[PDB]
Each structure stands twice: as C-alpha cells, then as structure tokens.
Subunit: 326 residues, 4 copies
C-alpha cells in the first residue's frame, strides 16, 4: 500500500525539506534494485570471483564489489544531492563535480559480506548520510564526522528476500523489494528491538585472541549463572545479515577488538556507524566496549572500530563486564 518513494516523500513533506534528501534516497533505491537484480543471478552473469585488486583495508576485491560500487557512485552523483562520497572500495574520498554537487556526504559499503558471495550467503549494502557542516570546499574532512551527526542511515539486505532498512530521526522502517513491479514496499513501521534477546552472534574462531571481558561474556551465554536456558548462537558471516537478525529477533552481535586488532575489523565510517545509528534509533545500543560508537570522531575515512550492538540489556551486561575488568 505504501512504497518507499511515497514514505520518503511524505516524511520529507513534514520535515519541510527542499527535496534534495528525497532525491538522494530515491537514487540510492534505484542502485539497490539494480544490485539486487544482479545478485539474484550473479553466477549466471559470471559476477563471482575476484576483480583483481586489494583495497586499503587489505581485502580481495570481487566482481560484484566493482559493479555495485560503480552503480552507487553513479546514482549518487546524478542525484544532485551529494558533494563528498566515501566508499570502502576507494582509497580516497570522491569529490563530486560542481555541476551535480549537493549538500550531502555519503559513506557506503557497496557490497558487504564478500566472504559469503561465492557460497550464496546473504550479503548487502550499507550507507550513512551526513549533512556537510564545513564552510570550505568539499573534501575528505567533511566525511570525518561522528556517527551522532547522521541524518539518515540503513542498509539493503539481499537475503531470502531483499529488504531496505532506513533509519532517520523519526525511527526505523523496513521496505521489501517486490521483484514484479520493482518497488520497495513498507512492511515494518517504526521498528523497535527487544530489550533482551536470546541469541549471541560472534566469530568464536578468534577465541584465542579475545579479551577477558568477551571471554567471560561468552562463557555466561553458554553457562548462565541463574541456570536459565543458554543463548542460541548465530553467525552468518555477513554483518548486514547478522545485524538485521539482531534487529528483528533481538540479542547481541559482536566484532570486538582483540589481541591482534586494537580497533577490531569492521569500518567505522561505512559499517559500524550506520548499524550503530539504526540500532540506536530502534532502542538498541552500539558500543566498542568502552565508548559509544556514534560518539567517535574519526581521523581516517577507512579507520576500524570494535563494535558490540543489539538489545540494551544484553549490550549493557557486556558493558558491565568491561567495566568490572577495567
């Protein structure tokens, strides 16, 4: 009954916007549909495999990475709403030509879950939208803002069905892509996460590198002190899929710093901040274990950050352990 286009229009309607943000979101939607279309038939299009390069964060690039990146970049430019773009696939920030230059700064992960591409596991796209604060000409510094400054954030999940999750000041809403008419349709309004869940999500293969706090927390999930039923475990391996499940089912998702990674693995700008924003707007929490992810002022567009997010009571319980060990 309600398409994403109508929702965004009516929302900007009340926000008294000028339509620039509206255009931005609409363009982002088009890119997401094209990505979804290619993803659902990637093997037939021979889009699996490596492209032949490595990014700044040291990662083997895939064909879909390139395709999805080109699609997002091009639609964002043509939107006339952006001035600075930060992509996981690009060493430096992309400065938009004066002509099509807008007032928004967009940070995105064109295709998240690369390790799961070839095995057909859910993958997605992550984005964060900021309003240019500086007065100087557009530059990389304009993307170095704390997550708390986000005006919009979300992700597209290409799972059993394709979903676009959009978070803004008013809340989180979920839209599902109807492949037949090529429109995202509202299916979940003002989503709120459960106060406490029963699932913990983490790669336990790093057990030997985990700090005592994460170690203690996991042990508590398996052997509850109150003799309650142990939490179930889930780790798809694609941040977008694990976070979405955390959002709708509740629980906790973790990619903590460890002995070999002081700042964890996930990227602050286009992975952690967007999910932290979605999570907080849904009544959830997102922390590094010592500080709120959204309060971090970045100094590098590709910097990493540890991230623990999900149901408030679960995240808080883990925070109490870090404090107890601190």
């Amino acid at each position: 009954i309600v398409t994403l286009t109508r929702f965004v229009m009516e929302e900007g309607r009340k926000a008294r916007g000028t339509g620039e943000m509206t255009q931005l979101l609409n363009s982002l939607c088009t890119a997401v549909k094209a990505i979804s279309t290619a993803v659902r038939k990637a093997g037939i299009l021979h889009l699996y495999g490596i492209a032949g390069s490595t990014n700044v964060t040291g990662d083997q690039v895939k064909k879909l990475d390139v395709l999805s990146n080109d699609l997002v970049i091009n639609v964002l430019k043509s939107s006339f709403a952006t001035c600075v773009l930060v992509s996981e696939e690009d060493k430096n920030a992309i400065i938009v030509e004066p002509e099509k230059r807008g007032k928004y700064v967009v940070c995105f992960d064109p295709l998240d879950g690369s390790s799961n591409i070839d095995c057909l596991v859910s993958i997605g796209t992550i984005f964060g939208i900021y309003r240019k604060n500086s007065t100087d000409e557009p530059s990389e510094k304009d993307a170095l803002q704390p997550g708390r400054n986000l005006v919009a954030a979300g992700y597209a999940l290409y799972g059993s069905a394709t979903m676009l999750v959009l978070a803004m000041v008013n809340g989180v809403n979920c839209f599902m892509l109807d492949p037949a008419i090529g429109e995202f349709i509202l299916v979940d309004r003002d989503v709120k996460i459960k106060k406490k869940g029963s699932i913990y999500s983490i790669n336990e293969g790093y057990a030997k590198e985990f700090d005592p706090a994460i170690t203690e927390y996991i042990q508590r999930k398996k052997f509850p002190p109150d003799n309650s039923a142990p939490y179930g475990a889930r780790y798809v391996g694609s941040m977008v899929a694990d976070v979405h499940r955390t959002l709708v089912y509740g629980g906790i998702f973790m990619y903590p710093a460890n002995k070999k990674s002081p700042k964890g693995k996930l990227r602050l700008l286009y992975e952690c901040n967007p999910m932290a924003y979605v999570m907080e707007k849904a009544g959830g929490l997102a922390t590094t274990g010592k500080e709120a992810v959204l309060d971090i002022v970045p100094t590098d567009i590709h910097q990493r950050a540890p991230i623990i997010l999900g149901s408030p009571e679960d995240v808080t319980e883990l925070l109490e352990i870090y404090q107890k060990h601190a």
Copy 2:
C-alpha cells in the same frame, strides 16, 4: 548454455531411463521455482508468521511451510513418477493414488530453516529420492530405506541467488535459477569438496550439553596444537545454507547428539540422508560420530540422527576423537 532440463534429459539419456525419473525431477524444479518466487517477496505476500499448528517433531509451523509443502506434494503427484511421499510437515507418509502412481519414493523438507524465515536469512528445500524396493502395495515402509539406497538427492537454496544442487550416482551439479527466463542454468559441474577446510559450523549455544569429543574438537579448532591459524566459525542457522557453504568452501558442519538429544535434532529421512548423499558424492563424509549416516536403517519416517559432515580430513579428525574416547 545448459538448462537443468537438458542436463537431466541427457543424463537419463545415457542412463537408458524410461523418463519417469526425468519427469520427477522436472516437476520438482517447477515447485522450487514457485517457492523461490514466493520467498523473494514473502513479506509482501504476508507469508511470514505461523500457520497455526505443530508437527510431529514438535515445531511451530509457518505460512511458507504450508504453501511450500502443498506445492511439492501437488507437483510430485502430477508427475506420475511417485508412489510414496514423506514430508516433514506430514505425520504419516502420503500414498499416491493408483492413477498418478509411479515407482519412486520421495522424502522432503519443503522449507528448511524455519527459525530464519522472519529475519530474511537463507532457507531452502531438501529432497531424497528412492526407488520402491518392496513388492507389496505402496506404504510407509517403502520410505524406511537406508540413505545408501538413494538414487538422487539434493536441495534448493534460496540465498543471495537461488541454487538447485543435484546429486546422483554420476556426481554433484549446481544449477542457478535465472529469474528472467525461469530456468535453472548449470553453473558448477561435477562439484568436489576440498579434502580439508578452515571453517567449523556448529551452534555453540549447546556447549553445556556437548559430549567430550565435540568439546575437544571445538577447543582444537580454536587452539590448534600445531600452532596453525585457528579455523573460522560460521553458523547461519539454516542447514541448507551451512551445508552448501561447507560443500563449496570446505570445512565441517555439525549437529551432534547431546546430553538431552541422544539422536540429535536433524531428521534422518529428509534432512540428514540427502545432505549425507550430496556430501559423499562430492568426496566428503557424513557420520553420526559412530556410524555412517547413509548406512542407518530407519524405523521411523520422522526419526532424528546426529550428523557431522564435510571435508574428509576434518570429519575424520573428529571421528578419531570419538574413537579415542570410545
């Protein structure tokens, strides 16, 4: 270049078949496409949620469960190739009317991964095909055959893309559904799994219930005695997704028996046997920890069985632990 229909035709061509098996597989394909179509837009069709009942294995039934079950049952009957059908969603075996009765017995899980439906995580369909051995009229007993008697087995995975994996005496082949023309296209021929992988897949939330062998094995994956890099962990929560990843990336998938479940959770007839068959035809192994899954003679169409499967060297290493503890 090669559709599933052509492959199956040319294969039965050499098998000197009469076309009954061919019809069966073609009908099964049609059901899978319809399921895939509904799955990709389930939320819009309002197919999420419970149907309002519980199966024999004690599980809350979902709307998609009913829809997918009806689709498979109906296409199998109309195929004129089956006589006995066993579904996870049906208390007793379904006996096909004399008119449309064929010589095949089909055991299937119309929709696997129910716990992951609402959160858009990959789900699928699993099937096993047997040739009626008895001489008596068709009955439930005809489905009580050991996996080693399988003539065909496989699964449909509704992940980032939809894939049909088919295993027969000649080997394992993967076909991807092209949504545009509605045809499954061969994308991976004679698939073989790696001798040794680097990923272990298990729900560690049951840590308190695991036997000493599984416990020791997991500890070894996290803290390798040869100081090699620890294995990475992955557990999507949908058997079809975890097994498919195990098939293409290698490694091990486990759903062992535990203190509260002597025979594990997964069902022998329509979950364990099919995956055990696919795995063995790909050069992999499938064991309960004490015996080959395919060698189990079932006494109940809905009986459970522990299952450990994947790369031969990984599965064998776990088997050595069970034997060491035995």
Copy 3:
C-alpha cells in the same frame, strides 16, 4: 544509462520547478509499471472479462479497466500534486481532498483499447496534465481547458515491450520499461515524426458512413494520382498502438466524424488532446478536419471529437480535401 526519474529530475531542474510536477510524473510511472505487470499476466490473474457496468460514453467495462483506474487515481492522489482528476471511467471529475491537493489537473484513460484486451492486442494508458488556471476552489470546470494549455502529455503502450512516451514543451521522449529492475529507461530522445509517411490507419468498416473527404482521401491512398506506390494500411484497433506506430513510422491515423457521429468516437479530454499534443510536439499535426484539436474549448469532460493526426504532409493533404469540399 538514463532512467525516467533522472530525466524528469534534470528537466525540472532546468525548468526551475518546485518538484510538484516531478512527483506527479514519478507517481504516474509507478502506476504504469503496476498496470504493465498485471497486463502481461492478465489471463492468469483472471483480469479478462467484464466488470459489470457501463460508462457515460456507453462502453462495457472490463476488470482491467477498474484495476488500472484505481491504480492511477490512488497514485495521483498520494502524489500531493493534483486537485482535479478526470477519468474515462468516472461520470464526474474527481476532486482531491485538501490535504493531498496539488495544483495539477490530470485527465486520463486508465486503459485504452478495451476491444483488444481479450485477444491480447496492444493496449495502453493515456494522460494529459494541465495547470489549474482558475482561482476558485477545484472543480470540473478546471478540466475544461483547451489542449493547447497542456503542460505535459503522453501514454504508456503495453505492446511487445512497454513504453512510456512523454511530451512536454521541450519535446517528446520515449522510455522503455526494463522488467528486471523495474525502471523506465530512455531509448529515444527528442523524437520527431517524418514529414510524409506511407501508411494510413482507419477502420474502413465505417465506409458507408464516411464523409466525401475521407472517402476521397482513402481512394487516393489506394489509387495514387501520380502513379506512386499505394500506401500500406494498418489498424490495430487500439488508439495507443496506432498512434505510436504513426509517431515512429510516420503516416496518418484517422477516426473522423461520420453520418452517425458528428463528433467522432474518441474522447477529447483524455484521448484526442494528449495524442494531439504528443503529435504536435513531434512536428506532426492533429485536426478534426476543420479545426486544430488542441484549440477546442471543451464544454463536457466526456465530449468526443473527430481526430486526424500524423505526418504534416499527409494530414495537410487530407485538410486540403475538406477545404475543397467545404
């Protein structure tokens, strides 16, 4: 490379618009995609047959008529860009609620070519957009403007492929719907019709009712006085299909007044005017035989008008006959 959304955005960009017209066109596009989707599978949806009523212009209503009408009406209202709507399927003009009221008046034929629905012949949707000129509250009178006052007009043709043809002051552009991503893509820019064609389109079954001018013209197309090759004949029976062919191939389309129909059959507001506008913006002509269609000031929202349109030299030759007989 260029979607309809981008084109309309960049065009309104230069037009210095406020975005209301842009929203209107985008909403109209969504309705057209939904209609196209239903049309391509109408028989399966059981959308063929009659709905059970007759319109003011005395015509048996079909199921698709109702569905397509509801879709256009609803998207136009939700666009926040319209105040008065005129549909072939509605006795009186529809006045939009103050809340979602905009400054545009839209006249449309939700589904043109009803006689060709059941036989799968091309059908379409026709629309004309006017800017409210009155100062009074919105009413039917606001739709009683001459075609020359059109700000935008066009049609969607559901033929071998689905095309959206949009004409505005700057010219005529054609966009084709890509079923895979659900986006209209620019395929023909600034379309111009040939000065002279070689095809005449008319229902010759009315031969006994035609005036001497039409009669003489047809005879000339079959037996050219200069001994040139006779014109070929084409009459699909759906105005949208015949006019589109006239636009791209050139020639003439005719639905003249006759002994039993002083004002012909086609409706001025939502059939003749839009096509007359598209035709004139493409360098073509549209006449009743005695006056320019676009210069007619209507007195009834459902009034009819004779229409002769197409290549200038062909239409002019017919006009010379009417004048010769006058």
Copy 4:
C-alpha cells in the same frame, strides 16, 4: 493449476508416446520464454534495427530475427527429437547431426511480424511439426509434406501478454506465460472459433491489385446486402496477432494472391500451414480461395501461398464468390 509441461505430459500419456514429442514441445517452450524475455526489453538490449542481410523471400533481417532463430535452432537440436529443420531465416533446410537426431521435422518462423518490431506492435513465433515419412536419410524433401500431415502446430504471440497456442489432433489449447515463475499456464481449453464473426482483416492498401472476388467480398463487408451492420475492420500487420484475434473473436483474415503475387505473400511451410492447422482444429477453415491450404503439396520449402482463414461461414461466403467468378 495446469502448466504446459503437465498438459503435454498427460496428453502424450494417453497418446502412448515415447516422450520424444514431449521433449520437442518442452524445448520449444524454453526458446519461446527466452524470446519473450528479450522482446519485452528489446529496445534496452538494442535488439531493434537490421542485422545486415536479406533472406530468400527477400526481406530485411532484424537483430531479433537472428537471436530468435539461433534460440529455436539450438533448443530443437538439443531436444534429440528432430532430424530436419526449416526456418524462414535459412536458405536451405538444416539437417540435424546423427547424435541429436530425432524423428521430427520442424518448420518455423522464429519471429513473425518484422514490419511491426520497431513500433512495438505484437509479434510472434510460428511452428509446424511433422513426422518423418521417408525412409531415406534426412533431407529437405522431408519437409515437403502437405499441411494435413501435421502432428502439431501453433504459435507464440508476444502481445499484451505472451501466449502459446498449441494445436494437435485432440484440439487447440492456449497457455499464458507467467513471467514471475517462468511457466506457461493453461488458460483456454479446447478452443473453438465462432461459426460467423463480425471482423474482416486485410491490408486494403493492395486494393488496386485485388482480384474481383476479394474486391466484391470487401464491398459486401462495408455495404451488406441484407442491410445488417457492416463488419468492423482490423489489421495489426502481424499475422500472429491478426490470426489469434480471428481465433478468439471470430471473423476472417486474408492475405490473398493478387495481380503481382500469384501465390500471395505468406509462406506455406512456416506461416500458412501452421495457422491453417490451428484454424481447422478449432472448427475454422483455411483456403487459398480455390483449394484447402492443408492439401497443398509443396515443391519449395520457401514457397508462398494465398491464405483466407477464420470462421467457417465467413470463409465459405468468400469461397462462394470465387466459385461464382470462376
């Protein structure tokens, strides 16, 4: 409820076939779906325009002609059911390699209605299936059989929706392609044409070349001697579209011989015979004006034939005129 695959299977079931005919039809269906998919987005794929050559019947070849021809040829060969193939796009008959050689001879028009491609008017595919009668090795002579020897015939119409019309000894059935699941679904069973219609279909641009019989008949359709209402006229310009409308609405379709074309324009092997067969199985008639189309023994695989077909009473009335003039 009933897919084309099931229908053909159950029909061959009763026919006691060996499955070769079944395979043939299934392969033909796959080609038709692929063609339909390309057609619905031809402009975006840049499939419009000429390929760069002329066929034996002297016609400018289009890109879609080549693509559709390659698709049909390849699927027919891979079917293992054919030995001799005759295509409008091929100078000589195609002899199938011994390996994939079957017992059927297929004559087809891969894409009919070329003149209507660029203007998005309905187009289609036409096919006729014969059983090899000769005992010698497969050759062109095996395709030189009279239409009355047809075992199956039909066409795919890519109109507002895509329809596959299949005629066999038991009757005519219509299947509509559901783009979502990529399956043809039965929508019209045992179709029968009306005894008398009210529409005549012919290119009147050839008025100066028509024989006195056709001339007299047209005059009678416009000025009925019994003062009944004149017949309506329709001529889409694509044989597949005009014949399908004739089949479902009744009436008459004509492409007669004329002063410059003793044998008309349409091709006997892959245009006239198939439609003549469909028409006769539906209770209709197909004549050259002097003899039954199906009784013509061809001497050239690309020979032409005049054709008058449709409702028995209409075709008979025209036959009475030819006889009256004879």
